[PDB]
Every structure is written in C-alpha cells, then in structure tokens.
Design a protein around this ligand. Structure first.
Ligand SMILES: Oc1c(Cl)cc(Cl)cc1Cl
Ligand SMILES: Oc1c(Cl)cc(Cl)cc1Cl
Ligand code: SF4
Ligand code: SF4
Ligand code: SF4
Ligand code: SF4
Lengths: 413, 416
C-alpha cells in the first residue's frame, strides 16, 4: 500500500501488512503459558493464579514481600480497577463496545440529535484551523501529547482480531475471529459481515500519548507498575471516544482504535511524538518510553507534524540497558535488522528485532505486565513508599507538567 | 493553608427542626412547573430543547453566546462541537438515575468485573480494616481516578434525596427521557446496596461518603455564558463519571461495597462542605481554596472504614456577607443579595438549613435564552482567580493548569 511521504521508518520490498492475530497476546504459539503449578492456561489466567498466590503470601511481585497482605491486596485492587473502561485488555475489537466506527448509536449522539452537529456539513475545511481545533480538543480529552500524520497503511493490520456483532460480552473471549481491514471508495467507515472497510478518503491519523506515572512504573515488574498501566488504558479509551465525537460534530468521520486497527509505535513515530527504541517502544522527549499510545483515524483535513530526531537511535546503539535487565532476555543486544525474529515481528522494516514470546512468557511468572525496560530506560527519568508518597491528579507530575503546556504555536505552524 | 483553617469536628451546616429530606424531582431541571421554557421564537419546550434551538441559531449566525459574535461560523461551530463531545461519558446531563448505565450500585455486571472474576477481588473479604490505612489507599486511588481534591465525611442522610428521579430498569436509552419516574431512597439493615421494584435501598452500614472535586478550566469558564464555559463543564461531567466508576471498583476490589452518584442520590455541595473541600457561598456552590467555586463535585458512598476529614473555615461566609459580586453579575437576578435564612424561596430549595436562598428557576430560565449553562457567577467570583484567544491560548492535559497544579500534590501527611 506504499509508504507515506517522509516517513522516518526504513523499509524494504519484503514489507507486508501484519495480521493482528500474530501478536504474542493472541497467537496460538504464544497464547498458552505454564502457571506456577505447571498447568497450561491462557497466559492471563496463569498470570491471574500468580496474582492470587502473591496476595495470599503478602507479596507485591514475584518474591517481593509486601508490608502485609493488606498492602498486597491493595495493589491488585488498584490495578483491576484501572481497567474499568477497557474491554478484554486493549479494546482491540474494532467497531465493538467502546470502539464504534460510527457515533450514531451512542447515547451522547442521541441526546444531542436535535442540534444535528453530526449531520451538518463542516464549517471549517482549512487544515491549519482544524489542526489547532483538534489538538486543543485532544488535550481536553486527556492526551499529554498529540501529533498528526498522514495515514500509512503499512501499519494498519491486514486483518483484525474481533468478535461477531451478535456475540454477547460474556462469550467474547471464546468467540474471537479474524476479519480483514480493507480500504474502499466508500463515503463512511462501514463494517459488513465480511470486511471492516476504511474509506480511501481516510487520510490522517491522530496519535495521542497518555503519560504514565514514573513512581509506580519504577516498581516494575510489581503490582503498582500494573496499576499505572491499567489506569492509562481507560484514559486511552476516554480519549478515543471524546476525540471521535468532537471530529464527528465538526462534520467529519473518525475511527477509534486504542490497541487495535494498527501498530501504535509506527504511527507515533510518523506523527512526531518520538523515536523507535531498542526495547521497541516510542521514546518521547517528555516521558521517554513511559507513556501509552492511542490513535484516531479521520478524513478531517489536517497539517501533518514533522518527525523528530533527538538522538534516540544513536543512544540505543550504545546503551543496551533494557536488554541487560530484561528478566526474559527478550530484547536484542545486537544491530537493527530487516528480518523479523519470529512470527510476532513484522518483517521488512529496519528495527531492533526482539523475541516477544519470551517477553509474554515472563508475565504469568511475575503476575504482572513487567515493564522493567521502561523503568530502567534512561529516557524515563519500595511499594509502601509509593502508597505513602507523592501523587497528583491522574498520576501526572506537577514538577513536569509545565512541559506539556500548549499554545497555538505548538499545535500548528 | 488547609491545616491552618481546619475546624473542629461536627457538620458546619446549621439546621432547624423543620429540615426534611428533599425529593430530587423538585430541582428546577425536573419539576413540572420549571421544566418547560420558551425558545427564542416563543415556543414552549423542555428547557434543554429550547436551549438546543438557541445553539443552532447561534451557530447559523456565527455566534459563541447570546449576541456574542464569533470569529466566523466555523469558530461558533467548533465551540458547540467541543461542548457536545465533552458529554460523551454522561447520561442525560448528570447521570442522575441511580443504578442505571454508568451508575450501577453493584459491580457484578460490569465487563471489567467479569474479566477479573477469576482473581475474585470483590468476593474476598477485606484484608484491611484499619480506617487510617484505608483512607490513605482510597485517597491515592481517588487522585489516580481524576480527582483534584478528595475528602471524606460521615454520610449525613439529610442531604440524601428522599426520592430519586430514575427510569425503569428495562427501558431502552432512546425512551429514557420520556419514562422518568420517582423512586424512594431508603436505609435498611441489608448487607449490600439493593434495588427492588419499589425501593432504592442503601444499607445502614453505609457509613461514609468520599467527595471528589474535579477542577474546570479557568480560561474557558471565564468565557461564561458563552460556549467554551459549556465545554469545560461538559468535559468535567465525563471525568466525574469515570472517577465514580474507577473508585467504586477499587473499593469493591478492596472487599467493601460502593455506590456512585455523580449528580444523583444527594446534594453534592452539602457533602463537600462536610467533607472539608470548601465552604458554601452566596451563589450556593462549595468554594474551595484551590479553585474557588470553579470545580465540579461527585461522590461515592461506602461502608469502607474511613477517617472523616475536618470541615474547613477560611472566611468565605464573612466574605460573601459583604461581597455580592455574583448576585450583581447574574444575568437572571437569581442570586439573593440578602442575609441567610432557614426558609427557601421556592419548591426548588430545601428549607431547614441556614443558607443563602436563591431562585433557581430564574437561573434555569436563563439557560435556554443564552444557549448554555451560564456560569457567570462562578467566573466572576474572586475565589476563582475572547474565545478566539482561548482557542489559540494556553491549554494542558484535561484542561488543568501547570501554574497551579503543584497545589494539589499529595503525600500521606495530606491524606490521613
Ligand atoms: O498492553 C497490555 C495488554 Cl493488551 C494486556 C495486559 Cl494484561 C497488559 C498490557 Cl500492558
Ligand atoms: O450541571 C449541569 C446540568 Cl445538571 C445539566 C446541564 Cl445541560 C448543564 C450543567 Cl452545567
Ligand atoms: S516488559 Fe519485561 S520482559 Fe518484556 S521486554 Fe520489557 S523488560 Fe523484558
Ligand atoms: S534502555 Fe537504553 S537501549 Fe533500551 S530503549 Fe532505553 S535508551 Fe534505548
Ligand atoms: S449560572 Fe448564571 S443565571 Fe444561574 S445563578 Fe449563576 S450567574 Fe445567575
Ligand atoms: S462572588 Fe462574592 S458573594 Fe458571590 S460567591 Fe463569590 S465571594 Fe461569595
């Protein structure tokens, strides 16, 4: 489908769109992991067993002794709660639950129907004004970072993981299917029984960074690192809906995504949020790798942001600290290559190729989402002290929040 | 500052033997005698549909508020698009129906609770019962959940509506605004919060209310009664919803029960004054030291053992006594200039507590006229301190301000 003009990502002729089912989370060869008694479950139920084992043993992480059982119970209570606004870890099913590709059935849209903002032709078509408007709205909607790229279809999954439109939530995990994402000359995003169809007019992607909390993430791989993670996933989801509603009420269409539809790191790099790293995350100037990503696709005319260079590639060439502290040795200590390390990597793009089945393998063992690489990364800079220590709204840091102040001069040039 | 002005314990709200609990249906939004308002053409409609007509006409005429011209139709349109989108996570302006949609009184049905079922966090009895430790856990959770301010108070049932506006549980959303009913809120010796066909039953073990302040954006609010004050208001209603759900789940995963409310179930201002977030003012809001009245409230009710905070006293009553600025700026002359009394001006007030008594039907009346939620009182109040410049000016995450965001940093010392 061809690269966007000016993409920083180096690719070759082997590049092919990547089927979502191949992530270590969903793929048949990775999805099953031993629990701490040797039974092979879905990886996240094995992880559930370790989470309960730790609570019964007064631990906050793998052999990390908590103050008492009550503190161990509290960290997992806070992490479970964090996921409140997220379906089945990642909101990946397109046009289901919170990820509707059309706003028409939404309660919010129905309440506002007499105004008809979603039916009224745009009053603004100038991309400069629109970029400013949508970025203001993106920050209201909880983004700490927001960039705009031209949509590069190489990062959009060839097929999505989803459930059929008639499967209730309580059977969803047992009925996940694959479904192609195709681009057609259609007026609006539409889903048929056969296809998820993105219009050919869907020209831009808006990428949002959702800042995690450094104190909690520095506890990786233990429970409070899980908590700052889970809370950001619900913020991503609020963001996607807020922003998608705004764009529709401006007279355009918007596709939400969270962890679905496409690969966030590639979009974020192309939208100027940061650079790809050895660990594989987007490293951002404001938060390093310790930030979540979500994205919204739209036909709204916009000004694309310039990709940014602050030396991450060269730094990662000489650093290797995530690789050394990775508990599963998933992160390569070697050069970037074009050839994926296993099924889980998309071949054809120059990157540090890491073994993500080894990464996922450490989650049931540790009972968490690890994140040790993010915590030890130099761009990112006990559990009782966290609970008793500094906190602020949404886990944002006052001592840092000045850096994400935005004036129109920072939103559009 | 907050410690310098701590009162001794006991509700700061002065009452007399007349005070009775208040039926929610009496608010100016819901009561049959105030619900209808004329649109600019003179047609009588539900207040929000007349206000809708004003919104459409202002866009069409390139305005951001009542005969306030916008830079162009496009800017007028953008402001209303931002307003409408802010409300995404809110049902019918306030989430008032208890145990419906986002305000579920139990967590068992929620998708998050189902996903986490195998760990069983909400079946496991509490591993912590010490109220000091729990106050610190739930406050830290509350800040993670989007509260800028969080307080704890013993639940005062005077401020709990005697009957709630709600909808039958099997009514689809499209029909909800035509099928609102009343339903009593009663306290009984039951283990869990429970809804029957006839009652909303809060257990007698529901000892406490956790009150959350959710800060609005000062630049946008200072554009009141125009569209951008409506947008910071709308976005904070969705934050209040997410707060309620986040915190309720945390409390349940800690092994207690939790009731969310947003604008339903009871009177947020009274709870906030008793929880120590601020004091009542002439306009009738809770004025906080960090934000003035420019903050929204929501609350969660729980049997979780907690340490009540102290009510606050930083001179607001004395100041409002001689200020009268909101009363003079109020476009509908809704705010009284006189002394506080125990008798409300109309059905919309709850008599029996000493307060400034305002005409809230005059207030609602100005919302269809101006096409917004006004807020001139909040914006002009000294404790709080064009739209093209706002759109091009300072913004940060969630509309919060870096220059003041240090004021809400919290450590254990501050929480319990
Ligand atoms: O991205 C995540 C997903 Cl999809 C699932 C889990 Cl359990 C954790 C994380 Cl950090
Ligand atoms: O508090 C509000 C309610 Cl209940 C309804 C609307 Cl439409 C606006 C506001 Cl600011
Ligand atoms: S999350 Fe943990 S296991 Fe996975 S790559 Fe990073 S450090 Fe290694
Ligand atoms: S720890 Fe070092 S090599 Fe790894 S991503 Fe961070 S800077 Fe790059
Ligand atoms: S919102 Fe406006 S009309 Fe209502 S009391 Fe305040 S100033 Fe008066
Ligand atoms: S404007 Fe003056 S009288 Fe009105 S609430 Fe604020 S301080 Fe009190």
């Amino acid at each position: 489908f061809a690269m966007t003009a000016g993409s920083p990502i180096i690719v070759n002729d082997k590049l092919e769109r990547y089927a979502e089912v191949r992530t270590a989370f969903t793929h048949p060869t990775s999805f099953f992991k031993p629990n701490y008694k040797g039974e092979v479950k879905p990886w996240f139920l094995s992880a559930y067993d370790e989470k309960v084992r730790q609570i019964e043993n007064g631990e906050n992480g793998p052999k990390m002794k908590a103050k008492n059982v009550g503190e161990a119970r509290a960290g997992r209570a806070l992490e479970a709660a964090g996921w409140t606004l997220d379906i089945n870890y990642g909101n990946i099913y397109p046009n289901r639950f919170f990820m509707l590709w059309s706003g028409e059935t939404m309660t919010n849209t129905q309440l506002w129907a007499p105004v008809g903002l979603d039916r009224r032709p745009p009053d603004t078509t100038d991309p400069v004004e629109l970029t400013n408007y949508v970025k203001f709205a993106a920050r209201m909607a909880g983004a700490d970072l927001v960039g705009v790229a031209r949509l590069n279809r190489n990062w959009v999954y060839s097929e999505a993981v989803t459930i059929p439109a008639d499967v209730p939530y309580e059977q969803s995990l047992h009925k996940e299917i694959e479904k192609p994402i195709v681009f057609k000359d259609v007026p609006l995003p539409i889903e048929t029984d056969d296809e998820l169809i993105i219009p050919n007019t869907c020209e831009n992607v808006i990428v949002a960074g959702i800042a995690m909390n450094r104190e909690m993430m520095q506890t990786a791989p233990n429970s409070m690192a899980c908590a700052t993670t889970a809370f950001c996933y619900s913020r991503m989801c609020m963001f996607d809906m807020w922003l998608c509603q705004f764009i529709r009420y401006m007279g355009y269409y918007a596709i939400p995504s969270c962890n679905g539809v496409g690969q966030s790191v590639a979009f974020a790099v192309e939208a100027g949020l940061g650079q790809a790293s050895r660990m594989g995350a987007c490293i951002t100037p404001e938060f390093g790798p310790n930030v979540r990503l979500t994205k919204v696709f739209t036909n709204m005319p916009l000004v694309p942001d310039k990709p940014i260079d602050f030396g991450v590639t060269e730094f990662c060439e000489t650093c290797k600290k995530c690789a050394r502290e990775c508990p599963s040795k998933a992160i390569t200590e070697g050069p970037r290559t074009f050839e994926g390390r296993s099924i889980h990597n998309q071949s054809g793009k120059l990157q540090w190729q890491n073994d993500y089945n080894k990464c996922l393998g450490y989650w049931p063992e540790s009972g968490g989402y690890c994140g040790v690489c993010v915590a030890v990364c130099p761009f990112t800079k006990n559990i009782t002290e966290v609970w008793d220590g500094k906190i602020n709204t949404y886990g944002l840091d006052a001592d840092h929040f000045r850096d994400t102040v935005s004036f129109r001069k920072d939103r559009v040039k």
